C-alpha cells in the first residue's frame, strides 16, 4: 500500500522515463493519499504540459496555489500554460511573479525564467 510520498517518487521515476500519462496517474494516486501537498499538483501539471493538456495543467496549478501561494513552479507552469493558450498578458505576469519569488527564495534556475519571459513578450508583440 504505497504512501503519497512513495507514489510521488514513483511518478518522478516515470517522468524521467518519459512515461507522462503514467506519471500523471501516479501523482493522482499521491493526491488520493494526501491531497494537501502542492507539489503533487505542480508535478502533475508539468506532465499535462508534456501531454498537451493545457487546461488540465492550468487547473492543477490553481490547486497548487491554493495550498502553497509561494510556489515558484506553480506560477512558472501557469505562465507556460497561458503562453501556449495565447493569454500573453497573464503569462507575462505569472512568469514575472515566478522570477520574483525565485529571487525571494534564493533559488537559481539559470536563465530559464528570463528566457520564458522574452518569449512571452516577443510572442505578445508578434501577435501585435
Amino acid at each position: 500500500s504505497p504512501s503519497a510520498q512513495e507514489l510521488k517518487e514513483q511518478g518522478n521515476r516515470l517522468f524521467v522515463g518519459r512515461k507522462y500519462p503514467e506519471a500523471a496517474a501516479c501523482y493522482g494516486r499521491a493526491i488520493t493519499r494526501n491531497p494537501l501537498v502542492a507539489v503533487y499538483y505542480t508535478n502533475r501539471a508539468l506532465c499535462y504540459l508534456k501531454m498537451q493538456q493545457h487546461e488540465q495543467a492550468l487547473a492543477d496549478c490553481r490547486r497548487a496555489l491554493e495550498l502553497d501561494g509561494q510556489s515558484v513552479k506553480a506560477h512558472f507552469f501557469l505562465g507556460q500554460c497561458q503562453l501556449e493558450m495565447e493569454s500573453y498578458d497573464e503569462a507575462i505576469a505569472n512568469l514575472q511573479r515566478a522570477y520574483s519569488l525565485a529571487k525571494e527564495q534564493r533559488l537559481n534556475f539559470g536563465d530559464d525564467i528570463p528566457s520564458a519571459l522574452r518569449i512571452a513578450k516577443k510572442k505578445r508583440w508578434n501577435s501585435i
Binding site: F15, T42, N43, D112
Partner: peptide, 5 residues
Amino acid sequence: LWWPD
C-alpha cells in the same frame, strides 16, 4: 525548473 519535485 522543468522537472518534478
